[PDB]
Every structure is written in C-alpha cells, then in structure tokens.
Design a binder for this molecule. Structure first.
Ligand SMILES: [Zn+2]
Lengths: 94, 59
RNA sequence: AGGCGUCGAAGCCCGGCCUCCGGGUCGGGUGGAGCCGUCCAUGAGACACCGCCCACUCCCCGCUGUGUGGCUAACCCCCGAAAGGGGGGACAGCGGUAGGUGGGCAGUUUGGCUGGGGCGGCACGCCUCCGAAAAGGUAUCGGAGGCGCCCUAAGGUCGGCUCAGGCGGGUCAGGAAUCCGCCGUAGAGUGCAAGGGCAAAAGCCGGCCUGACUGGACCCGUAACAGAGGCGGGUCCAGCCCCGAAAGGGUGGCCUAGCGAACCCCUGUGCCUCCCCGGUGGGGGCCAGGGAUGACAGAAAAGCUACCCUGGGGAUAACAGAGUCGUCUCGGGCGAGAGCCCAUAUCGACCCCGAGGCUUGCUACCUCGCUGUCGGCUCUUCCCAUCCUGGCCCUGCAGCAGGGGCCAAGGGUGGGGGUGUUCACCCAUUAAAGGGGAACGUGAGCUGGGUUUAGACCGUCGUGAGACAGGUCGGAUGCUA
RNA sequence: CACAGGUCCCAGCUAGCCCGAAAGGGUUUGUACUGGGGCCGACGCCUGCCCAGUGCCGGUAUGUGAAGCCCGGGUACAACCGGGUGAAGCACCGGUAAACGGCGGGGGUAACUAUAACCCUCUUAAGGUAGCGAAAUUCCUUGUCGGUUAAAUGCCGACCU
RNA sequence: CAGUUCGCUCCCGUGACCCCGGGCUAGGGGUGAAAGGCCAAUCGAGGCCGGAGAUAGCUGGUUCCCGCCGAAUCAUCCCGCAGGAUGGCCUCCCCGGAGGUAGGCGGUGGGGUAGAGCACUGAUUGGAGGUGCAGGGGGCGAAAGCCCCCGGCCUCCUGUCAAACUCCGAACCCACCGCCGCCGUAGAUGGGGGGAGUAGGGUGGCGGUGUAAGCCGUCCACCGAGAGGGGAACAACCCAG
RNA sequence: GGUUGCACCGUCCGUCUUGAAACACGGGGCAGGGAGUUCGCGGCCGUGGCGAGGUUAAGGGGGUUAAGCCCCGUAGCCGC
RNA sequence: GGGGGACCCUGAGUACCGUCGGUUGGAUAUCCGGCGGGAAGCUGGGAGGCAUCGGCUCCCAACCCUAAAUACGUCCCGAG
C-alpha cells in the first residue's frame, strides 16, 4: 500500500489540526541495563539447563505497521489508532 | 552402554596385567658411571630363553 | 598580488637522488643582477609569500605487542641411599578464565481427533450456503466452497450520469476497433468465496479532503437460554476537523473472514519514584503503539523394542459368538433371442423379486484378575440344496448311452504323489469316489509340520538402533475327577 | 561365536591407546619380527568403476569467529555504545573406498522373416567388470525345459525376465 | 527322587582337556571364543538397609436405624478425550414483600419447513414457427458469393425435476398484551449464603448418513434411579406410580 | 416355638456398567482386628460475651498434693 | 586522683576492586570460596540496600575468652 508522507491531522499537544510527517519505528536491540535483561544474565550463569523458552522460526507472514506522526509545529510525535497489516508499505509524496 | 576391552585394560585387573614374575628380569645396561671413561670386560656364562621377550637373553 | 635578490638572481657542467624516465628537488662551480603572474585561460590559480593538512615511504628517540634465533637460573625427566652428573627448557606441567568439538556419559521430549491403532486427513483458528426439523439451539473423518490478503484509494463527502445483452443503420471496418437510434427491473457492476443489500445508487465518471484522529460512557456477539480472559461490532458525549447552499453525513472498506494471554523487550509522550538528605549518570512505575505463540484460550522437543516391565481397559482391534447380507452359495418372474420351422429338449441376454448363514466384509453387543490357534489322527452325531444305490417325468429319448427335472437321507462315498497345508492339481481303481453343521465339533484325547516370543542367515528399506501380512534352520504341550 | 591365514590404521618412548576427582597408574621386568585399534576368515583362482554425499587426514591465501588487550565516545569514577587485533572451529582447497556407502533410467535399429546389440538422444561421481543366478536372495511362481515317480507345490541339471 | 532329576540313544575322551586348595577383578561396575550370556534358585543394570507411608487422572475397599426432599452423562475452555474448571440440573438456611405463568381463548407481529409450482438459477423428451445466425456437411462459383441438410439461438405446444431454486405456502412454533384457569401474605416471582453429585447413558418417535446392522443429533415419554397387575419368560411394550 | 406338608409366588450377596442369575470380577466356615485423622490458613453457618470498640500472645504474681483455680500483662491483630 | 602537650602507638597479600562457581528473600543492594590486582595506616579508616560528589549521623575490622535465660533424654522422681 501507498501512504502519504505528510498528513493534516489533530495534534494532541497543539490541540488543533496541523501537518504531521509519517515515520516508521526502528526496532532497537535489547538494553543490557534493563531489569529483565539483568535478571536473564544473572540466571544464565552457572551450571544448569537453559532456563527460558527458545522459539525457533516463529513470526507472522506480514506484521503490523508501527507508525509515528510528528507535528511540524511543535516537534512532538504521537500514534494514530492500531496498526494494520500490509506486506508492501511505500511512503509517497501524495 | 558397557565398557570396551581397551577401557577395561586400563584398570590393571589380572585379566589384563602382564605376568611379570615368570620372566627372567629387565634387560638394562650397567649404570653409566661405570661405563663412562672406563672399559669393563665381561664373560658370557649362559644363554637362556626368556618366556616373554621375543629374543634370547644372556648372563 | 607582491615576494625573492651581496638577509647574493637568470643563462651555462657535470655528481647523488626519488620519479606516471611526465618532469620536478638539490651540494659545488663558470656566472656578478635578475626571476613568476597581476593580464587570459582553468568547473576551482599561483612553482607570489605566509599557515594547517590530506596519499606512499624511510629514518633519530621513547612506548607497545606478535613471531624468529640463542642462553640458564625457575620448572620437568633420567641415573644415583646420598653427594652429584646428564637431558629438555621459560616450552611442557599446574592453577583461573574464554570459544569450539563432543551420544563417551546423563536428564528429558517425541501432542490430539480417529467407526481399534498406524499411514492418510485436519472435521485442531475463522467466513458463506445447505444439513437444520418456517422463533432460538442442534452433532458426525456430514455435503459444497473460501480466509491467514489488498486498497491513499478500492477511505469521507458533494454534484452529474446509468449498466449487461439484443435489434436496425453506418468510409476503410469484417464475428470483433469508433459512432447514431430503439428495446432494455438489472439478465451488469460493487477488490477477492458465498449469501444478503444496492438504479435521479452503495455502480461509473469528476471536484474537494483524511473521521483509517484524541479523551470517555453504555450495550450486543464469540459464549441463545446460562458462567468468560482476549477479540469483533453497535448507540452516543466532548475536542479538533473534512465535504456541502443547507438539511445531513464522516470513529476505514455496503454487512458477515483476513488473526493472538502472562513474562520480557522496542518506540511515543509526560508525570510519579529509587532505603538519612541534596546534585548527576543509571534503574523502577503509570498510559498508548508494536515484535507470537497456525496444536491458533498461547510447553522450547526425534526414534526402536521380537530382551521388554507396570497399572488398566470387552470404554478398543486379531480368533470365536451375536446383528446384517453388500459379497458368497442356491433358487424364482418376463422372454430378446440361439436351436433347419419351433422361446421354453437344451442355453437363455437386458431387467426384476427372493431363500440360506456353508466365503468374505461391515458393526463393536458378550468375553482382556486369560474361553489355549491352523492342519492332521481318533470318535460320535445331524441337515438336504442327492454323487452312487431304490422309483419316476420331459427330451432335438432307435438301442447302448446322454441333457434337464421330481420323490427319496436306510446304506455307501475308498487308496495313493508333490505340498504344514484346508482347498486345488495329478495317478490307478470304483456303483459313486456329494457339498455342509455340531464354539471354522473334538489339545483336563493325541501330534506339533505351519502361524505367533526369546538365537541366527539372506534380500530390501533406514544415517542408526532396527523393521518387513518376505523367505530360511532351531525352538516346552502341566491334571490324584 | 572362536580359530590359523589375509589386509588396513595409530605409535620412536615424556610415544600410541586406556583407568581416575587427583595423586598416581594398565599395556610395561615391554620397544616396530613390538604394543594397541577395525574388518574379512583354512586352502585354490581372483578382488572391476566411482571421492559428487557422509566420515577421516593435510593445507588454510581469504571471510566469519569468544574472552583478553588497544583506540574513540559516555560516565567528576563505572555500568553502557562503536571500531581494531583476533586462536581453535566452520567456509574454502587437496588426498583417501580391504573408510560408511553407490555402481541408473526412455526411442529405433543388423528385418539374408520376426527378434536381438553394433547404433543416437537426455543423464550422473560412475553405471555392476570376472563370477554366480526361481538362490537360506524370485513377488508373479507350483517360472519354462530336461531327469527322477503310475502319479512330483519336492530334489537335482539348464535358461535368464 | 529332584524349584532342571531318571532311563535308552548320542558326542569328546593327550588336549583350546577335566577336577581340587590358595588368591585377585564389585554394580553403569566386573567378566564375556559375544548368547545381552554369567556375577550365590535374582541380571536389558545384583543383593541388603535407608530416602519411603514415593507417585498415578488407573484397579479394589470404605462398618447402625428410621424420616423429608431428590439429580446428571448437556454447553464453553484445558497436550483436553478413562481427568479437571465455569455453567445447567439437586438440597439446606436466610433476607424481601405482591405479584407469577407450565395450560387455554382472542388479538398485535415474526417465519419459509411439509406440500406445490416454473416467475429467477440450474436440469429435462419430441414437434412447429422465426432467425444465416461467426458454426459444420455436401453440391456450387475464380472468388463477389449461392442451394439445401444438420447444428446454434428465440417463441409456442407437448412430457418431466431440485438439500445447497421459489411467483406462492400450511400444520406448527416463538415474542408481547387482555381475559379464563392455577399458584402466592401459612410468603410465590426474585435475591444472598453453605454443601454437593453429574463430563460413558439406554429404549422409543423424528432428521442427516449407511446395503443393513450401526454411527451422529434431536423429542423427555419409560428404564437408569421404579414396586404391584399382564404380554410364557422381557429394561424399554399395556394398566399403574 | 421346632420340623414338615399343601396352594401360589420367588433365577444368591457385593461391584464396574446403558444393561448381572450370568459362560464378567470379588465370594469353604467361624472368631478377633480393619479405613475422613491432626495441624496451619481461608469462606460460611448455630450459639454466647463485650461493643465504637473487641481481644489477648509470650510472660509475672497469689494459691494449691498438683499442670487444676484467681488476678495482672496493650506488645501485637482486626475495626473505626 | 586530676589538667596540658607540639612527640609516639592503635592488627596486610588484609579491607577493597574485576571475574568465575556455590549459596541466599538479598533483588544492578546476602554470605562463602578460587583466580588476577591490591591501599591508607591517626594530618588515619569504615558503614548508612545501583555507582560517584557534597553534607549529616553512627562506628574503629583484618587477634582472643566469657556464666544465666536454650537443645536432648541412653537415666531418675512424679502424673494421666
Ligand atoms: Zn503539534
């Protein structure tokens, strides 16, 4: 599907309809300073079997779109509803 | 599983131990202090068959 | 835009030098006073001068490691009670840590439904039609199909128009290119299955837009009655907006499919919080969006057992019984015909109606705290749908014989070859050498050749353990009624 | 099953293989005519092709590759992030089948009848050579022919589908 | 006689031979001329004591009497299918205080089954008429095309169909209202709390499926959980609780 | 009351199971023994005390042959 | 027995840091052990639940001993 690069929509911070740029969330790796990762590293040490499930090749054919819309007037970003599943996502100047 | 013959041999049981009491004895040279810088003369007394050597021994 | 020049310059000669040998740098000396643009070219101008670099390389000092060669003094190996001698050597050995390899050794897993189980299939998550019995609900490995997407337009609104097919007439132009007229209830189209809905539209053609948005309430469905995490849908309040003159509509696709808990992690945003207090780095918490578990209400996960073991199950298969008779055996109705004429001496197509439980199958009703298998031997008994013996009828019955049928179950129906065989085939006789039931009669009567444990070989399949309704050799038969 | 015989593999000694937590130890009072590890199995004649796969061995220019170390950022110090160095092992290359295993498949002919391989087309690492064959291997099968019997799902000989 | 013995028959019997006393190898271990054989009547991991009264959704058992009421084997979820949880059905106690509806009559609405029918969608025998209609078969013509037969497509007549067809359409069922009847102040409808059992049903009528038996649902009548009187005995059939 | 006769009726007991006289399992006789116990937490009920308050725990004193009996004990817990 | 000092003393492979294994409710914040490092030391040092800086509060390790209140019953008295 083709999606506009800019859309005029409501801005929660400006409390009015402004121009928002469309951007996609980039999935960063796990942080080693988080409590969950600290617990995982602590329990992985020493003798014993693997303590967590190990899923292999588990993923949906197509995934939902995690989009953020950033207001061009205030510079803050927000979300618009739930994601939708399309295999092809093309941002166009339309 | 069970052990192999090679594995059982390493434990030194009488099934695998060499019977080193029916043999004529170890064949080693005289200590090197006698041989160094000096020449010794000996006489052959007897030639015998060592049970396990694959070679005759002499006194 | 001047800088160099006794703070010594062009033009002449050889020497070393790097070098795309382009052509530049430089010691000495004949040399004793000149050298470049600025001007134009160059995509970007000065070998005018003053600065920092960037591309390769070398060398002077210091730092760092990696490898190589040598040494003995740690350490080790040998000889010797010892003294000491010899060999190796900062390796090896030992201690700590890091990655790989690793069925040598372990703990485990290898799902479920299933007209037994296995293989197969998924009825294991959803949508439509029939089943389904005119409110609701209703199952089967019931029947017929679809889904795990796609669309910035195929989404919102406003204006205008009417489709498929057919007929008649037209330059190339024909069955089919484009155009005029008429009939035309949708026979078209609506993204995709099916059902339903849509004609001054929900279809086609255009204009303007992003309501496919933010903070919340209530209700229906999955899941009737009648409990529900998650999810889907409907009716609204407020904010900011879109289309329109206005009414009015807009919380995605005309309605019904296109999808997912806990924990953890990533992103957005603006608040709370971290042990006596304060600042900083970092962490934790609240709200929103996303990464998936298809066995789809969400374990991470391969097999053999014939050396097998345990708890059970007639909730469930093999032998046998029971129900049924598709199949099997045996009949019947009609008569196209074949028989020199003649349907019925004999055979009887295509169809149709039955009997038996003697073949096989189907169900899973009795029996898994045991009802001992096939075949053979011994012995007893029963049925008739009669093979011979007794008596008859028709004949395409001259006789001798044959073909078909009727009454009749007293008697008989035997001996041998290969094969474990029943059966079937064959041999010599015979009046004939009938088919079946009795827990496929009969192992507290026998035998043990086959089948169906534990040993072993061959062929095929499997990486392997191993397996084969494939062959092959051996392999136990209890008893005082 | 074992066996004498054949052949292959590892090892020059502080070796190779093996027991163990370690210390120490078995082979070993041993030294390649030896010690240890597979497979076949007297004797006679022989033992053909294939290294693409799975194993094992040698190399490893090059890529990846953990900790440690070094450099930059960050932290008034660390946690944390990016880069360089980077052994073994994999990737890659070569030997190896008396290592595990494998050794195929369609058309037409030479019609001096008919039917055979000389022959031409896909195809792999290669297409089963000498032998033996209805075999303890053959489903059809009680294959077909010959001998054995009066009679042969047996037995022997032969053919090869 | 014996928890592996006896008789006949058979095999080795100078060798890898048979037997005795002293020793060593101990359980994931020993030993094995390899059968998973042997290791004190025990071996695909010995025996003794301990963990230990281990665990099981699987089998068995569970002790006096009378009185009152009295089920279920049906839906959703679970590596769930011989087991559990939430509901449905039973029982006991309490609050609250005037309505409630299993049956019937009339009314206001809803439905598409049986039957029937061809008006859509798809099948279906023959005939007649129209249409050259892009079809085929012949004759026929240099070529522009004709003449018939057959075929296709429409209309009519004639003879037949539909679980996944409907221009029609019952019996019947459901929702609501008024009334009759019945229940209720000796307390119903409803609400709160305590305790369960039930997750194999069977026969019978109806529906899908199957040659049939049977399998799967549905109806709630009978057995299950039910005496007595009958069908000769009978779970289910009749009278009757 | 013991035994027996006649007429009619009556296929044992426990158990899983839709279905038991069962050719489904447990059943020679008799006597004794034999199976919902204890603690901790929680829900609920019957009754009793006090009541915007309720109650003590460990422990202490008095008395007693004695561990019985009498008084104290506000820490703590629940509620407001 | 009290005041002052400007001199001296007050525990080292230890405290602590990194990493690894075990253990713990101890969670970036328990304790023990191995390996590689490793101080100050009176003008000194440590703790205050992630790490560091400032304040404030408390304390002085790396040496030793210590009755009573406690745990048990091979034994005894007494009791149910
Ligand atoms: Zn804004």
């Amino acid at each position: 599907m083709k999606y506009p690069k800019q859309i005029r929509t409501y801005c929660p911070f400006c409390k009015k309809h402004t121009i928002h740029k469309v951007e996609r969330v980039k999935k960063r790796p796990r942080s080693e300073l988080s409590a969950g990762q600290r617990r995982f590293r602590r329990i992985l040490k020493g003798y014993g079997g693997f303590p967590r499930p190990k899923p292999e090749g588990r993923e949906k054919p197509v995934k939902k779109l995690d989009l953020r819309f950033r207001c061009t007037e205030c510079g803050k970003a927000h979300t618009r509803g739930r994601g939708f599943r399309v295999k092809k996502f093309e941002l166009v100047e339309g | 599983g069970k052990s192999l013959i090679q594995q059982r041999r390493g434990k030194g049981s009488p099934t695998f131990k060499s019977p080193s009491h029916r043999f004529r004895g170890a064949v080693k040279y005289i200590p090197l202090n006698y041989t160094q810088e000096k020449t010794l003369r000996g006489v052959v007394e007897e030639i015998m068959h060592d049970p396990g050597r694959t070679a005759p021994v002499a006194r």
